[PDB]
Motif scaffolding. Structure first.
Motif, PDB file in Angstrom:
ATOM      1  N   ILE A  59       5.487   1.592  -1.608  1.00  0.00           N
ATOM      2  CA  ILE A  59       5.500   0.030  -2.145  1.00  0.00           C
ATOM      3  C   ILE A  59       6.202  -0.783  -1.311  1.00  0.00           C
ATOM      4  O   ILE A  59       5.610  -1.946  -0.774  1.00  0.00           O
ATOM      5  CB  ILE A  59       6.009   0.128  -3.463  1.00  0.00           C
ATOM      6  N   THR A  60       7.410  -0.220  -0.894  1.00  0.00           N
ATOM      7  CA  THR A  60       8.172  -1.083  -0.066  1.00  0.00           C
ATOM      8  C   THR A  60       7.800  -1.497   1.330  1.00  0.00           C
ATOM      9  O   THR A  60       8.098  -2.583   2.087  1.00  0.00           O
ATOM     10  CB  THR A  60       9.771  -0.513   0.323  1.00  0.00           C
ATOM     11  N   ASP A  61       6.875  -0.346   2.067  1.00  0.00           N
ATOM     12  CA  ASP A  61       6.310  -0.881   3.208  1.00  0.00           C
ATOM     13  C   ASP A  61       5.017  -1.916   3.070  1.00  0.00           C
ATOM     14  O   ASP A  61       4.834  -2.573   3.830  1.00  0.00           O
ATOM     15  CB  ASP A  61       5.778   0.390   3.960  1.00  0.00           C
ATOM     16  N   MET A  62       4.527  -1.800   1.875  1.00  0.00           N
ATOM     17  CA  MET A  62       3.582  -2.699   1.419  1.00  0.00           C
ATOM     18  C   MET A  62       3.968  -4.091   1.356  1.00  0.00           C
ATOM     19  O   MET A  62       3.656  -4.921   2.102  1.00  0.00           O
ATOM     20  CB  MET A  62       2.919  -2.487   0.080  1.00  0.00           C
ATOM     21  N   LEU A  63       5.145  -4.286   0.594  1.00  0.00           N
ATOM     22  CA  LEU A  63       5.753  -5.487   0.482  1.00  0.00           C
ATOM     23  C   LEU A  63       6.301  -6.046   1.954  1.00  0.00           C
ATOM     24  O   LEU A  63       6.071  -7.279   2.124  1.00  0.00           O
ATOM     25  CB  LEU A  63       6.920  -5.422  -0.465  1.00  0.00           C
ATOM     26  N   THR A  64       6.828  -4.937   2.759  1.00  0.00           N
ATOM     27  CA  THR A  64       7.195  -5.432   4.008  1.00  0.00           C
ATOM     28  C   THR A  64       6.095  -5.875   5.004  1.00  0.00           C
ATOM     29  O   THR A  64       6.311  -6.971   5.766  1.00  0.00           O
ATOM     30  CB  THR A  64       8.051  -4.108   4.722  1.00  0.00           C
ATOM     31  N   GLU A  65       5.062  -5.407   5.027  1.00  0.00           N
ATOM     32  CA  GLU A  65       3.976  -5.846   5.698  1.00  0.00           C
ATOM     33  C   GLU A  65       3.387  -7.191   5.145  1.00  0.00           C
ATOM     34  O   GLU A  65       3.161  -7.815   6.128  1.00  0.00           O
ATOM     35  CB  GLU A  65       2.682  -4.941   5.451  1.00  0.00           C
ATOM     36  N   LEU A  66       3.568  -7.354   3.763  1.00  0.00           N
ATOM     37  CA  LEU A  66       3.159  -8.645   3.136  1.00  0.00           C
ATOM     38  C   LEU A  66       4.169  -9.573   3.664  1.00  0.00           C
ATOM     39  O   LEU A  66       3.673 -10.889   4.113  1.00  0.00           O
ATOM     40  CB  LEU A  66       3.100  -8.716   1.797  1.00  0.00           C
ATOM     41  N   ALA A  67       5.472  -9.294   3.803  1.00  0.00           N
ATOM     42  CA  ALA A  67       6.464 -10.286   4.112  1.00  0.00           C
ATOM     43  C   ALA A  67       6.093 -10.652   5.584  1.00  0.00           C
ATOM     44  O   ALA A  67       6.231 -11.935   6.041  1.00  0.00           O
ATOM     45  CB  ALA A  67       8.036  -9.535   4.175  1.00  0.00           C
ATOM     46  N   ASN A  68       5.763  -9.838   6.600  1.00  0.00           N
ATOM     47  CA  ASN A  68       5.765 -10.143   7.781  1.00  0.00           C
ATOM     48  C   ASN A  68       4.426 -11.059   7.993  1.00  0.00           C
ATOM     49  O   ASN A  68       4.522 -11.862   9.173  1.00  0.00           O
ATOM     50  CB  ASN A  68       5.631  -8.932   8.765  1.00  0.00           C
ATOM     51  N   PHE A  69       3.409 -10.740   7.481  1.00  0.00           N
ATOM     52  CA  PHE A  69       2.230 -11.666   7.456  1.00  0.00           C
ATOM     53  C   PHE A  69       2.724 -13.197   6.809  1.00  0.00           C
ATOM     54  O   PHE A  69       2.280 -14.117   7.467  1.00  0.00           O
ATOM     55  CB  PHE A  69       1.105 -11.011   6.713  1.00  0.00           C
ATOM     56  N   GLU A  70       3.481 -13.119   5.891  1.00  0.00           N
ATOM     57  CA  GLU A  70       3.647 -14.552   5.607  1.00  0.00           C
ATOM     58  C   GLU A  70       4.593 -15.511   6.595  1.00  0.00           C
ATOM     59  O   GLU A  70       4.384 -16.415   6.742  1.00  0.00           O
ATOM     60  CB  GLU A  70       4.806 -14.555   4.137  1.00  0.00           C
ATOM     61  N   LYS A  71       5.652 -14.457   7.116  1.00  0.00           N
ATOM     62  CA  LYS A  71       6.364 -15.142   7.943  1.00  0.00           C
ATOM     63  C   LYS A  71       5.679 -15.732   9.286  1.00  0.00           C
ATOM     64  O   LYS A  71       5.507 -16.907   9.710  1.00  0.00           O
ATOM     65  CB  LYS A  71       7.745 -14.397   8.620  1.00  0.00           C
ATOM     66  N   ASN A  72       4.988 -14.503   9.668  1.00  0.00           N
ATOM     67  CA  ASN A  72       4.424 -14.861  11.093  1.00  0.00           C
ATOM     68  C   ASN A  72       2.843 -15.563  11.204  1.00  0.00           C
ATOM     69  O   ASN A  72       2.758 -16.189  12.220  1.00  0.00           O
ATOM     70  CB  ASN A  72       4.438 -13.323  12.117  1.00  0.00           C
ATOM     71  N   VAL A  73       2.238 -15.360  10.069  1.00  0.00           N
ATOM     72  CA  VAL A  73       1.085 -15.734  10.158  1.00  0.00           C
ATOM     73  C   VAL A  73       0.811 -17.125   9.237  1.00  0.00           C
ATOM     74  O   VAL A  73       0.293 -17.903   9.804  1.00  0.00           O
ATOM     75  CB  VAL A  73      -0.046 -14.836   9.870  1.00  0.00           C
TER      76      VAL A  73
END
Ligand SMILES: *O[C@H]1CCO[C@@H]1COP(=O)(O)OP(=O)(O)OC[C@H]1O[C@@H](n2cnc3c(N)ncnc32)[C@H](O)[C@@H]1O
Ligand code: NA
Ligand code: NA
Length: 326
Positions: A9-23
């Motif tokens: 779950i936390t890696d999921m949210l982390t991936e999502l976090a990064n996509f929102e920031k960078n993309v």
DNA sequence: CCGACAGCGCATCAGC
DNA sequence: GCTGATGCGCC
């Protein structure tokens, strides 16, 4: 808790976090996903459902939904799609280069520049920071063990004192909090001849560290803040050390200990210490501690001569850097 | 329903 | 030339 509990779950949210920031360029969604990931990471139970999660502060309906889809399927359709998207995955990746943020990365991907290899063969289109980011790409993602960090500090303290023995220098960040590992080295710097109401104190220090070949590159540098790269000297006949990120800040004497306090952190401590300081009727920022008058009017900065001085303003017993975890 | 969500030093860019 | 906005990394 450990990774096994809710790591998926936390890696999921982390991936999502990064996509929102960078993309997507949605810094507030980036921080929300991270808040969520963080609070779930401390939660000492294997979560069973979105609703269970939603009870935690920072987890709303949308994340509780995502957790449910993941729990039932073991993946998120959105993440799966994103992961396979050449454009998005390349944009996200390029941001790992220091100096390439989401805007540069989008620009590069807009013109076919998608990999480190494309960056390498397109040097002219990179600024100075980015080139150092590229050159040290692999080095910059490595952690810094405390022992190397101890050796780095030895060097910084010795050389600063040689420049002028009246300098005061403090390696802050997690290292000062006794962390076993570090991300970089942050050095806070002050001198008696430099107060709020008052030459090239910083340049002189940077230069000495460059003279003994400790500082190897410069990302940015002015009168008060230096950002760059350093490297411990390789033991005779032995693999080189990684190049490391180091920042050096020159602060006025009267705001120095506020600076140390702030840059030692960590965040949770500062947020809670500021929170409690608000309950107690003062305001603390990175630079000062100001009292609040009857309505809400912050008066002038209070005299601070140590970290404890600011504790001794807001009725707290000086916590050691070891336990400024939260 | 809607805005806050930290804000600063420095490099570099947009525009005068 | 200069000034201000923008991008960036950073507790
Ligand atoms: O970020 C959301 C939370 C606060 O406001 C926005 C929008 O909320 P909603 O309108 O209720 O939902 P939606 O815009 O559809 O979802 C936004 C993101 O989640 C993905 N997504 C698309 N469609 C859905 C549905 N039907 N359910 C859940 N998530 C959904 C989108 O790709 C968006 O990134
Ligand atoms: Na919640
Ligand atoms: Na970057």
């Amino acid at each position: 808790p450990q990774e096994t509990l809710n790591g998926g779950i936390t890696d999921m949210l982390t991936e999502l976090a990064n996509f929102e920031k960078n993309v997507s360029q949605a810094i507030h969604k980036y921080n929300a996903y991270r808040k969520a990931a963080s609070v779930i990471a401390k939660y000492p139970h294997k979560i069973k459902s979105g609703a269970e999660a939603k009870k935690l502060p920072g987890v709303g309906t949308k994340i509780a939904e995502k957790i449910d889809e993941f729990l039932a399927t073991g993946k998120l359709r959105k993440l799966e799609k994103i992961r396979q998207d050449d454009t998005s995955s390349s944009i996200n990746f390029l941001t790992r280069v220091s100096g390439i943020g989401p805007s540069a990365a989008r620009k590069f991907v807009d013109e076919g520049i998608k990999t480190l290899e494309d960056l390498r063969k397109n040097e002219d289109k990179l600024n100075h920071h980015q080139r150092i980011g590229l050159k040290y790409f692999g080095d910059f993602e490595k952690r810094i063990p405390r022992e190397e960090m101890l050796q780095m500090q030895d060097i910084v303290l010795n050389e600063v004192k040689k420049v002028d023995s009246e300098y005061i220098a403090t390696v802050c960040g997690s290292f000062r909090r006794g962390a076993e590992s570090s991300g970089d080295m942050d050095v806070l710097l002050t001198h008696p001849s430099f107060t709020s109401e008052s030459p090239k104190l910083l340049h002189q220090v940077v230069e000495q560290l460059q003279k003994v070949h400790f500082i190897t590159d410069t990302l940015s540098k002015g009168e008060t803040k230096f950002m760059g790269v350093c490297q411990l000297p390789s033991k005779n006949d032995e693999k080189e050390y990684p190049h490391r990120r180091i920042d050096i800040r020159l602060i006025p004497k009267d705001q120095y200990y506020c600076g140390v306090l702030y840059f030692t952190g960590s965040d949770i401590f500062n947020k809670n210490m500021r929170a409690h300081a608000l309950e107690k009727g003062f305001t603390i920022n990175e630079y000062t501690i100001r009292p609040l008058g009857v309505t809400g009017v912050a008066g002038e900065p209070l005299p601070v001569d140590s970290e404890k001085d600011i504790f001794d303003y807001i009725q707290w017993k000086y916590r050691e850097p070891k336990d400024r975890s939260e």
